[PDB]
């Protein structure tokens, strides 16, 4: 029966209470590496957990000789209730977001050394205590004035543990309150980095004071049933909206409902005749009231068309200038709008990132009328938007970008106002832009056309759901699995070669490598170490591992350009156009038969093709179509878009799922061997009689944290795909393929309902390394592919750095992104790893920096002065002075 003595510490073994009680009991367990404590407050059982991994220190230490043995946590634990259901942090006063230590009176016939083997280490300190919205928060006395990021970044250093909010009483003021803020910013990030609870912060900020010599900063906070996490002013890629309101760039924020450790909240947490729990209620009073830091009081905003799957929403700070409310009311106008979820998906339009070109105007706009055509009783606009932007629209946008202005490509996906469509190129475009009205959402007065992606010619790539749900036509194995078989252990070559291996590597981009391609144009190396190939090796290592685990394939002749759509209405109802750019596969060795021109490095496609849409499950989404060489087609510079007919009957785009042209994907692939053999059938409500609120909004909101509907689609086509080789003559997967028209994303006509079939079955692939229970016998070639599976000082510094737990040897592991032997070291969470590597490898990069730059400066490898150093094994096998430059200008101008 040990006892809680929660609070902080303020000297280096005195500790200041905040909390008691009586009655814990304690258990560990090896197994996950859990210890669990077992208090009750007075009318309940409650229960702790805390894992292994969230311990920052463990003392030994010593109180009145029976015990106490301390305990510093860096995430708080999770509580439970009695029937076990989460809570909501029962103390009285909000302790558990304000102590951060978790020292427990251990009274047993043992004291600690019972249990200290399960625990990291222990070191005896015996001393004695000292003294007695949203937590844990730090707030500027009266009397001083310091920058606002000074105020979160000292509320991040004592949510982090490097700080003690005791200690912050006017001294750091008065010490810090006449500097610049950049030597503030370094010595904060010296101290980011030290070990644990700098306890003089006075001498600290001195000492180091002796030595006085596009992308927007973001703050984010991470709201969690307990306390609140700051995260420090770092870099985003700016949205429109934030972007806009430029001064005010402090009273904006990123907020993420996220668990103790920082994961998304499963909807298991948030409702288990189901009844809701603590944390509902929580995160539904924290968005309708609001929270308050130093001088802010931030209040909803809004939510992107991301972020509703991504848990966040931008907050504001309302202040004497500017509201939310003024904002909401500046981005469109929400008052006649029903169904209250397409109000909330509508009104984060403008919330997604992009390079905004060029506010052009409303009168250069033309509308012209849209192509429609009437049939049946239903109409087919023919258009989810399409746009004719002139080819010197797209020559200017290509700069702003950074692209080549002399070949721009044939498309973008505009946003621009109320609507929202890809504007394919047009040569007989008679202004810079002509919109008609099918995709306009809210008679907004927003403009300055953003950009979210452009016609572009991707390397093709796919996996186990391609092959799947696009192979029960026609297309059976060797496709999928020769190219793996092949090029996953033949290529990677360290030693021999690299003439077609860094654009194998690459072809996911080839940003990483430049040695290779640089290894024979300049000298091999001036010494021989063999650590330049076990580098190689590493990222060898890299690639395989990835392609192998996410099983990765490709098909030749294709690419994945966006949807086009004719104009000269010469195709009647079956004809499309491809005009595809080549590579160097393509551009060597060029003779296929498919091909119409190959005029140097563009080749038409003459034979039947098919596309399709992604996230399409209805029978028929692939349409096979008659490719022709339409002569003006080609007069009008097509390349790479997929040209759709605009004359006969029930569009080809809408016969896809429901999709016309708003900027989606069509994978196209002119390969004879992957093309139908023939369409699979092409087959031919909620009102609240008021206008919108904002708490409708927020339950909608907090409604999907727990009804999710992907998964939905997801495993039920699973099953009645894979699992039973039916294509869609069932009437249940054709019924699912129903159902899910209006409940495919859960922003729709509303929340239609999380799982209207019986349920989500509890099974997945036979790769999550918990296969319970398996179906027969294990078909589609997953497994057959998953088968065939200064200097010296520095160093030493590295290697102290890198020799905690850590299993790294002499320098293989200290250097590989990852250990190089894993197992099952990381199949649980596989997040032990990166966090860790990530911080290490920043700082001894900034360290190497520095200690290269701040010195004819860096000599020895700006002009070859400092020769005894490529002797071999002068020190051990790693020889020092390899980074950033490795064959950059020794190997430019000094030899040849």
Not at 475 to 504: R, Y
Not at 787 to 795: D, F, M, P, V
């Amino acid at each position: 029966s040990a006892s809680l003595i929660l609070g902080n510490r303020v000297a280096e073994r005195e500790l200041e209470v905040a909390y008691s009680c009586d009655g814990v009991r304690a258990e560990v367990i090896p197994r996950m590496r859990r210890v669990d404590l077992y208090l009750k407050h007075d009318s309940q059982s409650y229960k702790l957990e805390v894992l292994f991994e969230d311990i920052n220190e463990c003392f030994g230490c010593h109180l009145d000789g029976t015990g106490a043995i301390l305990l510093q946590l860096t995430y708080a634990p999770r509580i439970h209730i009695a029937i076990w259901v989460r809570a909501l942090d029962f103390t009285p006063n909000s302790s558990f977001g304000e102590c951060s230590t978790l020292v427990l009176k251990l009274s047993k016939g043992a004291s600690v050394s019972y249990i200290l083997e399960s625990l990291p280490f222990s070191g005896e300190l015996g001393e004695l205590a000292i003294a007695s919205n949203v937590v844990p928060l730090v707030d500027c006395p009266n009397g001083f004035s310091v920058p606002y990021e000074v105020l979160f970044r000292l509320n991040s250093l004592v949510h982090m543990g490097k700080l003690v909010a005791r200690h912050v009483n006017a001294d750091l003021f008065k010490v810090l309150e006449d500097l610049s803020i950049d030597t503030l910013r370094r010595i904060f990030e010296k101290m980011s980095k030290l070990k644990s609870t700098c306890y003089e912060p006075l001498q600290f900020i001195r000492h180091e004071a002796h030595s006085m010599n596009k992308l927007m900063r973001c703050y984010r906070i991470h709201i969690t049933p307990s306390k609140i996490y700051c995260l420090g002013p770092e870099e985003e890629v700016s949205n429109y909206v934030v972007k806009y309101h430029s001064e005010y760039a402090s009273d904006f924020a990123r907020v993420t409902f996220v668990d103790e450790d920082w994961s998304k909240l499963s909807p298991n947490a948030l409702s288990a005749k189901p009844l809701k729990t603590g944390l509902y209620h929580r995160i539904l009073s924290i968005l309708k009231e609001g929270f308050c830091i130093g001088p802010k009081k931030y209040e909803f905003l809004a939510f992107s068309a991301s972020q509703l799957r991504g848990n966040s929403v931008w907050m504001f700070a309302s202040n004497s200038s500017l509201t939310a409310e003024n904002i909401r009311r500046w981005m469109g106008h929400f008052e006649d709008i029903r169904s209250v979820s397409k109000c909330a998906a509508r009104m984060g339009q403008l919330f997604s990132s992009s390079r905004q070109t060029f506010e052009v105007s409303s009168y250069d706009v033309e509308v012209i009328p849209d192509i429609e055509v009437t049939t049946d009783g239903t109409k087919y606009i023919f258009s989810d938007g399409i746009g004719k932007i002139s080819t010197r629209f797209a020559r200017q946008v290509a700069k702003l970008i950074g692209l080549d202005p002399a070949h721009p490509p044939s498309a973008f996906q505009i946003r621009y106002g109320g609507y929202k469509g890809v504007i394919t190129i047009d040569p007989t475009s008679f202004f810079n832009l002509s919109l008609r009205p099918s995709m306009k959402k809210f008679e907004s007065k927003s403009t300055m056309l953003n950009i979210t992606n452009w016609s572009k010619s991707q390397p093709c790539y796919v996996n186990r759901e391609i092959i799947s749900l696009l192979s029960t036509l026609g297309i059976k194995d060797e496709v999928f699995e020769s190219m793996q078989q092949d090029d996953m252990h033949e290529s990677d070559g360290m030693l021999t070669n690299k003439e077609a291996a860094l654009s194998v590597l690459g072809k996911i981009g080839g940003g990483d490598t430049k040695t290779a391609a640089d290894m024979l144009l300049q000298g091999y190396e001036p010494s021989s170490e063999p650590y330049l190939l076990m580098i190689l090796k590493a990222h060898r290592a890299n690639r395989l591992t990835d392609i192998r685990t996410r099983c990765k394939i490709h098909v030749q002749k294709g690419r994945v350009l966006i949807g086009c759509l004719d104009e000269t209405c010469k195709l009647e109802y079956g004809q499309v156009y491809i005009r595809i750019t080549k590579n160097h596969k393509e551009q060597k060795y060029s003779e296929q038969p498919f091909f119409c021109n190959d005029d140097g490095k563009t080749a038409v496609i003459v034979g039947k093709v098919a596309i399709t849409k992604n996230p399409c499950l209805h029978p028929g989404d692939v349409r096979v179509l008659e490719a022709v060489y339409d002569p003006g087609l080609d007069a009008r510079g097509l390349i790479d878009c997929v040209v759709f007919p605009q004359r006969g009957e029930r569009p080809h785009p809408n016969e896809c799922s429901g999709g016309d042209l708003d900027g989606d994907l069509f994978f196209i692939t002119w390969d004879d061997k992957l093309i139908p053999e023939k369409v699979d059938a092409p087959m031919d409500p909620r009102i609240m009689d008021h206008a919108v609120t904002l708490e409708e909004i927020q339950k909608h909101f907090v409604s999907y944290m727990i009804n999710d509907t992907l998964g939905a689609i997801s495993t039920a086509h699973l099953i009645h795909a894979d699992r039973d080789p039916l294509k869609a003559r069932s009437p249940e997967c054709v019924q699912l393929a129903a159902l899910h028209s209006m409940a495919v994303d859960f922003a729709k006509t509303g929340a239609p309902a999380e799982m209207p079939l019986a349920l989500r079955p509890r099974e997945f692939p036979d790769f999550m390394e918990r296969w319970e229970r398996p179906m027969y016998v294990s078909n589609g070639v997953l497994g057959k592919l998953y088968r065939a599976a200064e200097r010296y000082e520095a160093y030493a510094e590295r290697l102290g750095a890198l020799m905690t737990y850590y299993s790294a040897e002499r320098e293989d592991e200290i250097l590989t992104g990852n250990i190089r032997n894993k197992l099952v070291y990381l199949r649980r969470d596989n997040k032990r790893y990166f966090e860790m590597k990530d911080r290490i490898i920043a700082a001894v990069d900034a360290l190497h920096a520095e200690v290269r730059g701040w010195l004819r400066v860096a000599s020895a490898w700006y002009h070859v002065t400092y020769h005894p150093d490529r002797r071999g094994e002068k020190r051990f096998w790693s020889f020092p002075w390899i980074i950033c430059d490795t064959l950059l200008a020794i190997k430019a101008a000094r030899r040849c």
